[PDB]
Amino acid sequence: TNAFCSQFSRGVYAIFGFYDKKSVNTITSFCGTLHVSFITPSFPTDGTHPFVIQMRPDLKGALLSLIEYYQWDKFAYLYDSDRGLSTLQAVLDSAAEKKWQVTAINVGNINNDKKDETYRSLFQDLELKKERRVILDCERDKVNDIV
Amino acid sequence: NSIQIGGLFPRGADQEYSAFRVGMVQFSTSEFRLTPHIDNLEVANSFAVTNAFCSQFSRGVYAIFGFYDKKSVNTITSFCGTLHVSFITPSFPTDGTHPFVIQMRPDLKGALLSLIEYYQWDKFAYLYDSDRGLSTLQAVLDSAAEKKWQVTAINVGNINNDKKDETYRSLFQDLELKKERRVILDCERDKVNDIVDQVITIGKHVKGYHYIIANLGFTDGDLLKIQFGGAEVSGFQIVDYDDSLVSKFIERWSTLEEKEYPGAHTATIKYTSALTYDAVQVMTEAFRNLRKQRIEISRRGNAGDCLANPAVPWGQGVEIERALKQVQVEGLSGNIKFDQNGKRINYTINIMELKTNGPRKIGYWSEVDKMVLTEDDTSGLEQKTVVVTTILESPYVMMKKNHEMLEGNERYEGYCVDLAAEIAKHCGFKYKLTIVGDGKYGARDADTKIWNGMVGELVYGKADIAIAPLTITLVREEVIDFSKPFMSL
Amino acid sequence: DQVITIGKHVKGYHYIIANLGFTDGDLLKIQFGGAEVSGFQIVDYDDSL
Numbered sequence: 001t002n003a004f005c006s007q008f009s010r011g012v013y014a015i016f017g018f019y020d021k022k023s024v025n026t027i028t029s030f031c032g033t034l035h036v037s038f039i040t041p042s043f044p045t046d047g048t049h050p051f052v053i054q055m056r057p058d059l060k061g062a063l064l065s066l067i068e069y070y071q072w073d074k075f076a077y078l079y080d081s082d083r084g085l086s087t088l089q090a091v092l093d094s095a096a097e098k099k100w101q102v103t104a105i106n107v108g109n110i111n112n113d114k115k116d117e118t119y120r121s122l123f124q125d126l127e128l129k130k131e132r133r134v135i136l137d138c139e140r141d142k143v144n145d146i147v
Numbered sequence: 148n149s150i151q152i153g154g155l156f157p158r159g160a161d162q163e164y165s166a167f168r169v170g171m172v173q174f175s176t177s178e179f180r181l182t183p184h185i186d187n188l189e190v191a192n193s194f195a196v197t198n199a200f201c202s203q204f205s206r207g208v209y210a211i212f213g214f215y216d217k218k219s220v221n222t223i224t225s226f227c228g229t230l231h232v233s234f235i236t237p238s239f240p241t242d243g244t245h246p247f248v249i250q251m252r253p254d255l256k257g258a259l260l261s262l263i264e265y266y267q268w269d270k271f272a273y274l275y276d277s278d279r280g281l282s283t284l285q286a287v288l289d290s291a292a293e294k295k296w297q298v299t300a301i302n303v304g305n306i307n308n309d310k311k312d313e314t315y316r317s318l319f320q321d322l323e324l325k326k327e328r329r330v331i332l333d334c335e336r337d338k339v340n341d342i343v344d345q346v347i348t349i350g351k352h353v354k355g356y357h358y359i360i361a362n363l364g365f366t367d368g369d370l371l372k373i374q375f376g377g378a379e380v381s382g383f384q385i386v387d388y389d390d391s392l393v394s395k396f397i398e399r400w401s402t403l404e405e406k407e408y409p410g411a412h413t414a415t416i417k418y419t420s421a422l423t424y425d426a427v428q429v430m431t432e433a434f435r436n437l438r439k440q441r442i443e444i445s446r447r448g449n450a451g452d453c454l455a456n457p458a459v460p461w462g463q464g465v466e467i468e469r470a471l472k473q474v475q476v477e478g479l480s481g482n483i484k485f486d487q488n489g490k491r492i493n494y495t496i497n498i499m500e501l502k503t504n505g506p507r508k509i510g511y512w513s514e515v516d517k518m519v520l521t522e523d524d525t526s527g528l529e530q531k532t533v534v535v536t537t538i539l540e541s542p543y544v545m546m547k548k549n550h551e552m553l554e555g556n557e558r559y560e561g562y563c564v565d566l567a568a569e570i571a572k573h574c575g576f577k578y579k580l581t582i583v584g585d586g587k588y589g590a591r592d593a594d595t596k597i598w599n600g601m602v603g604e605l606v607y608g609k610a611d612i613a614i615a616p617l618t619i620t621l622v623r624e625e626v627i628d629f630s631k632p633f634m635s636l
Numbered sequence: 637d638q639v640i641t642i643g644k645h646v647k648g649y650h651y652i653i654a655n656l657g658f659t660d661g662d663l664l665k666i667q668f669g670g671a672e673v674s675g676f677q678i679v680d681y682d683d684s685l
């Protein structure tokens with residue numbers, strides 16, 4: 001908020017920047033009220049929003065297309081709350097219509113000292129159905145930490 | 148003295164602002180007067196929430212009471228954590244450890260996970276609305292992996308107003324295909340009413356269906372419509388209408404006028420309004436415990452704007468937070484006690500259940516023990532257990548080889564044990580195999596005229612049927628009733 | 637209204653309405669659910685007059 005209003009004082013004609021899950025609502029409301037265009041490489045907002053120009057295209061379509069290609073019916077879906085929950089809602093709604101057996105697990109509330117401790121308890125519970133198909137839904141730092 | 152506070156209410160918080168002003172009356176003690184402000188706004192609009200916060204911060208407030216949605220929840224906790232202005236809410240409990248936000252909707256995650264374990268579910272649906280995070284969906288999906296559940300969560304949040312009818316109807320047709328008899332409705336009062344209107348219209352409130360309503364508002368929507376039919380709808384409730392403070396309240400709640408206090412002439416309070424009434428109790432006692440320690444606060448009246456850069460804190464703000472979180476008052480929702488974060492600790496959720504006479508408490512959940520199953524421990528009105536009498540005779544009844552480690556109707560085997568199992572599934576009853584006492588078949592004594600054996604237990608009431616090698620004779624036919632012979636010899 | 641409330645408009649039930657007024661009462665309420673309600677009508681709404 002305080003950075004957005006300092007831009008509005010100096011009178012800019014476009015605001016380029018990133019947002020998070022905890023700041024997507026702050027931006028799209030401030031940009032939708034004070035009518036200021038916002039170009040972002042962050043995740044596309046889930047919902048018709050004016051005045052916000054998303055540069056990251058979409059992944060909900062291509063991820064559901066790739067699952068059907070490999071003809072999966074019983075995978076596991078490790079996800080991360082930051083960058084939103086839209087892709088989780090996509091694969092859960094397509095699981096009902098296509099008889100999947102998703103085993104969605106939040107892996108984003110992990111602190112960096114019980115890191116190894118929880119991850120061993122994580123893949124323990126994946127051997128409770130013996131899951132051989134995982135969809136890492138994280139971004140680069142946490143993907144390398146799981147790999 | 149007088150404490151200035153603030154107010155953030157949605158356009159449509161009629162009963163919540165009514166129950167606010169009722170607690171303004173009843174919790175004044177006139178040494179201090181918590182004079183409030185009013186800033187009716189859109190909660191799902193981060194501009195208006197920011198604007199109204201800074202205005203109140205400008206106008207010298209010590210605690211802001213408001214509601215947030217999941218489009219302003221991170222706007223609230225950031226501003227209230229940077230500028231230390233404490234925030235009291237009855238809205239949904241945040242996912243995390245956000246300080247300086249005192250939250251009164253306690254938790255329904257552990258109560259909902261306990262109730263599914265109680266009914267022994269393995270396949271259910273989880274119709275949810277976005278509406279307040281996804282923290283309850285994420286709790287049941289994490290527990291699905293380890294507790295062998297098969298959640299089938301669909302996303303009833305984005306259904307448009309015009310095409311509501313064809314969308315709900317096509318939804319339960321999909322649940323019909325994979326035969327989802329068990330459904331969990333994680334919506335609020337408005338959308339729970341819209342869903343239960345649709346399960347009636349297509350006829351899925353009949354016997355066989357179960358419906359847990361994941362809401363601390365069970366007796367706050369229309370349940371009369373689904374009370375008959377055969378559905379076994381359960382739920383949760385914090386406002387118990389059978390206790391002292393609530394029964395006093397419903398008396399003075401019903402006497403009010405629906406012209407100055409809207410939605411206040413009934414005998415059912417919404418849980419958001421009750422926790423709003425419980426909030427002014429906490430805000431009173433916290434500044435009363437700030438009167439009791441002889442503490443005065445915040446000589447400011449000055450602070451011109453929230454966006455200060457450098458954002459300057461105010462050191463009394465920590466102390467007001469300290470006061471608000473050690474408030475162990477009791478109110479409409481039970482034992483109001485907060486932890487170090489602002490999340491309600493020890494509290495009680497009444498697991499209600501809807502039956503033909505009405506809603507009916509069948510347990511209570513607390514954080515400390517578990518879901519404690521209350522009374523209705525005895526009242527079931529069973530069919531009957533039928534006392535069937537036989538005698539130890541081969542192959543009619545023989546004790547099984549390992550009869551020491553067995554108990555019930557499976558200690559025994561033989562012809563009459565297999566016969567009693569066949570009589571039970573044609574006549575439809577449940578039986579108790581009972582070897583006779585004396586060890587006779589039955590004979591009337593020549594002197595005392597007392598029947599012994601298996602005839603004597605049917606004449607004298609100690610038995611209900613004798614599935615046994617009992618010979619059809621003349622003197623037994625006069626006192627008991629035989630069937631046609633199952634064995635001629 | 638009462639067969640809806642106790643849940644007897646589901647599949648398996650039939651309901652002939654002995655009335656020359658079939659499309660003159662609320663039938664939308666019982667149109668979904670599985671009941672096979674028939675009836676009679678003299679006013680045909682597909683003809684000239």
Ligand SMILES: O=c1[nH]c2cc(C(F)(F)F)c(N3CCOCC3)cc2n(CP(=O)(O)O)c1=O
Pocket residue numbers: 540588589616617618619
């Ligand atoms: O109702 C009766 N049913 C009986 C059934 C049996 C059996 F065969 F075991 F089923 C026997 N036995 C026959 C051989 O000696 C051992 C037990 C006696 C029975 N008696 C006594 P009884 O008829 O006066 O002899 C009854 O009164």
